[PDB]
Design a protein around this ligand. Sequence first.
Ligand SMILES: [Mg+2]
Ligand SMILES: [Mg+2]
Lengths: 154, 154
Amino acid sequence: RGMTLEDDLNATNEYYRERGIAVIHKKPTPVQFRQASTTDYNGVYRGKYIDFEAKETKNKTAFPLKNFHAHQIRHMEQVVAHGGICFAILRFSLLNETYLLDASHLIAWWNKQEAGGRKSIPKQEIERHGHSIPLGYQPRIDYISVVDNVYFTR
Amino acid sequence: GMTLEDDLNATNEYYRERGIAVIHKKPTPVAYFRQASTTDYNGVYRGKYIDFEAKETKNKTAFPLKNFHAHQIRHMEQVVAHGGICFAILRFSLLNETYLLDASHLIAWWNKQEAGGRKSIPKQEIERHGHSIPLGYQPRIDYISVVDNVYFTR
Ligand SMILES: [Mg+2]
Ligand SMILES: [Mg+2]
């Protein structure tokens, strides 16, 4: 059960809410299936606005940018400009490795792609600029532990 | 668009395009319409989490609490506990009056119902504890001007 990144995040976000750690939800799918103009997850943690998109790939050496679209990137650009904590949770399924990558890096790669660059982010770039997320029983994907250390004054 | 919802859509689009704030209305949960587990609007402004519900009434002396449900109130309580800016935008359509009321007040009034309290908030109470929101061509409902003056230090 619960194999996909989406399933793991559902279990994780429910845990964070029920245990009083953070209030983050996956936005309902736009019906009136239309394509969303924002990222799928957002909420509040320590008074700050948290916003992220989560994608996974079977690729073992690079993360395909086709997993994202222009509107999501534009939205992330706006969130960053307004002081929100924005990132992508990227999983390499076949390696059981999940990373948190700040939106600034995803935005840059998306733009480079648009400028004629490669259409996938090399995994080494994600390891370099991103943060490995601890996996466990509960929460399954402890991305808040990473958010704490990266975006707040410990 | 004449409804409060339409006015907020036009207002939020303006705020995003002008680089003032990034706020969106969440899609309605779904040929069966599911009831939302959170309030309809959230986003970021000046690095803070913003969250609100917007309702309107044709009543000219009090705002019916039936316009909100338990799930939304509980969500607001959680947002407040986690340091977010949370409020309700209440519009008296026939008076052409729109107010911002902090969640703390809405929560208090809503919880008093089960105790035997009235099922509506007197407009006088909203004027007393709430804040009138300036109306215009663009933005139509300038609630961010109120948010900035009420939740941030000059
Ligand atoms: Mg999306
Ligand atoms: Mg709602």
